[PDB]
Structures are given as structure tokens and as C-alpha cells.
């Protein structure tokens, strides 16, 4: 062993055949059961190069999650490439479960155990495994939810920091909990999210410090909201209990040197721009009754302005391959012998 290689991975999960939650249903027919006693072979003094930005695992995961969504969250109407696709659009139970990605016989997965690994180049503390850790396929913009935390300090990753067109992925080391609700009272499409103001402020400060560490210690770090675009990437958008939330993130991303809970106003939308492909999807009205999500903010997607002393950063996202990237960064598939 071994050699960096490409093969068709398979997925494993602890999905329950009796749960009608759609990730479970999908995973029940799509995945095999997890190993209760998973094995790890530590190669403590072996160095291996990684490139999270060129990782086929992401592409495969992307495919899988497209399949999952296309089977699980069926829109009443889909507008795509001159076609109108209509189908039964039941409101369903929707709550992501962890998915493990596994190398078939003849192959193994390399895991980087360097705790400050910037996602590209050499990794010195590597181990070999059959499967990745459980990755929750959360589809969102701006904020990464319910993901894995940095073990030590905050870590920021970019394919190329000096290139302002390349997305910056922030991995926090402390979760910031965000509670989003469509109150049942009314306006069934009116929702909101609450989170701790001071935790968020300190999170921004620590991210700012880490950004200066990268772009220069004399540089003033500023956060501004999105410059514009589709509602999905201008707002913090996500799916909570099968409903599509669009939350105004101005209060999250307006910050410079200069209440208790931050309350973000949100709308539940029925007519969505799709992440899987270019077009629209139209869903049935919000369910009455409880719509409620509590999530760990565990990461961020940022873009940098670029172009005199000051650096402005804005919330980004849109390419979900980055979301998968935020979790698969420490992995690569290899062939044994």
C-alpha cells in the first residue's frame, strides 16, 4: 500500500427501516449498516498530500445527495430546461442523519489526523479507515450547520487565499446554537431564528483574528452582508423539517471594531431556486403545526472583496460541493498495493 485512486464508494448509515423520515428511507435502500467496532490503522509518521478542492469523494457525495433530495423532497412543480415536471408533493419528515462513505474491497480511505490541516498539501499524521465519519448531508447557504468542529482552534480554508474569487470555508471550534421556528400562534410563512448575541460576536472576533493571521495583522477586518444575487445566497437559507427557510442574516454579518438574543426574521418559501440543477421548484404550503429546528452553527462560507488596508468579507455559499467539502476535506480514497 498504497496509491491515490478513484473508485465507486458505497455509503453506510444507522438508518432505521421503521422510520418514515426520508433520509432514513433513502439510506435504508441506498446504504449498508455501520460497523459498531470500526477499525483505524494509525500511520503516525507517514506523510501524504491532500487536496480538498480536488476530491472525487465530494462529487460522489454530491450525486448521492441529489438522488436523496430528488427522491425525498418532491416538488409539486419543477421548471427546468423548457420542461414542466409535476408530481405528488407530500409534506414529509425531513431531518438529516449521518452518512458514512466507504471504500470497497481493494481500496482504503486515508484520514488526516493533523488538527490544523489547511486542506491542501502535506499531512503528516495519517491513518487508514474503511469509512469516513458520519456526515450529515445538510444543504444550506452562508452557515454550515450540524457539522464537525475543529478539534483545537478555528480553521479557515481556501483553495487560494490571495484569490478573491475562491470561497473561504470557516470551521469553528465551538458550536453556536441557532433555534429557528415558524411559531404556531397567523402567517404560516413567517418564521424566525434566535441565537446568542455574545457567542456570535465572539465567534466573529475569533474568525477576524484568524483572518488577519492569514491576510496581515495590520489589516482591518470587516464583515458585510451579501452584495446581492438569488434570495438563497443573499439570505441564510436552509431546510427545517422539510420547509425552506430564508433568513435575513444582516445582523450576523454586519461587524467592525465599533439585546440578548439575535433574532433573524425568516420566510418560508414555496418557490425555490434549485441547488441540484438550474431551475425552479414549487412546493406545497407550509404544514400547520410544529416547524422547529435547533442547529449547531459549526462553520461558515465567506467571500473576500479584494482590490487598501481594509478587508471586507461577506457570507457566501451556493455550491453545495463546498458543504460536502467542509466535511470530506480530511479524506482521500486510495488503492491498496
Amino acid at each position: 500500500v498504497w496509491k491515490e485512486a478513484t473508485t465507486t464508494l458505497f455509503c453506510a448509515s444507522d438508518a432505521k427501516a421503521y422510520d418514515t423520515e426520508v433520509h432514513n428511507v433513502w439510506a435504508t435502500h441506498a446504504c449498508v449498516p455501520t460497523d459498531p467496532n470500526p477499525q483505524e490503522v494509525k500511520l503516525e509518521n507517514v506523510t501524504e498530500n491532500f487536496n480538498m478542492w480536488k476530491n472525487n469523494m465530494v462529487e460522489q457525495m454530491h450525486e448521492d445527495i441529489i438522488s436523496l433530495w430528488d427522491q425525498s423532497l418532491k416538488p409539486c412543480v419543477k421548471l427546468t430546461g423548457g420542461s414542466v415536471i409535476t408530481q405528488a408533493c407530500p409534506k414529509v419528515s425531513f431531518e438529516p442523519i449521518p452518512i458514512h462513505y466507504c471504500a470497497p474491497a481493494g481500496f482504503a480511505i486515508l484520514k488526516c489526523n493533523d488538527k490544523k490541516f489547511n486542506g491542501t498539501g502535506p499531512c503528516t499524521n495519517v491513518s487508514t479507515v474503511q469509512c469516513t465519519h458520519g456526515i450529515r448531508p445538510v444543504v444550506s447557504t452562508q452557515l454550515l450547520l450540524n457539522g464537525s468542529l475543529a478539534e483545537e482552534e478555528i480553521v479557515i480554508r481556501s483553495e487560494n487565499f490571495t484569490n478573491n474569487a475562491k470561497t473561504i470555508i470557516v470551521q469553528l471550534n465551538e458550536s453556536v446554537v441557532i433555534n429557528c421556528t415558524r411559531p404556531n400562534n397567523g402567517d404560516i410563512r413567517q418564521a424566525h431564528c434566535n441565537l446568542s448575541k455574545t457567542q456570535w460576536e465572539n465567534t466573529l472576533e475569533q474568525i477576524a483574528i484568524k483572518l488577519k493571521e492569514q491576510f496581515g495583522n495590520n489589516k482591518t477586518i470587516i464583515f458585510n452582508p451579501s452584495s446581492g444575487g438569488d434570495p438563497e445566497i443573499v439570505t441564510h437559507s436552509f431546510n427545517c423539517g422539510g420547509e425552506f427557510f430564508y433568513c435575513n442574516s444582516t445582523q450576523l454579518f454586519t461587524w467592525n471594531d465599533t439585546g440578548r438574543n439575535i433574532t433573524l426574521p425568516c420566510r418560508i418559501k414555496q418557490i425555490i431556486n434549485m441547488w441540484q440543477e438550474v431551475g425552479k421548484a414549487m412546493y406545497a404550503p407550509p404544514i400547520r403545526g410544529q416547524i422547529r429546528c435547533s442547529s449547531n452553527i459549526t462553520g461558515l462560507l465567506l467571500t473576500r472583496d479584494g482590490g487598501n488596508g481594509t478587508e471586507i468579507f461577506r457570507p457566501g455559499g451556493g455550491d453545495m460541493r463546498d458543504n460536502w467539502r467542509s466535511e470530506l476535506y480530511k479524506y482521500k480514497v486510495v488503492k491498496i498495493e
Binding site: S227, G318, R321
Partner: peptide, 27 residues
Amino acid sequence: XNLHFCQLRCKSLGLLGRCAXTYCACV
């Protein structure tokens, strides 16, 4: 994402348009 229509949209805002996956982003 349609990049052309996106670039038109962002142009109206005085901004560049580029794709973010399957979304339009104005930079």
C-alpha cells in the same frame, strides 16, 4: 445559474455577476 441572465441582473445593480453553483451571485 444561467450566467448571461445573471450578469444582466447584477449589471443592473452595478455589480459583476457570476455563478455560485446553480445560483446567481452578484459580486
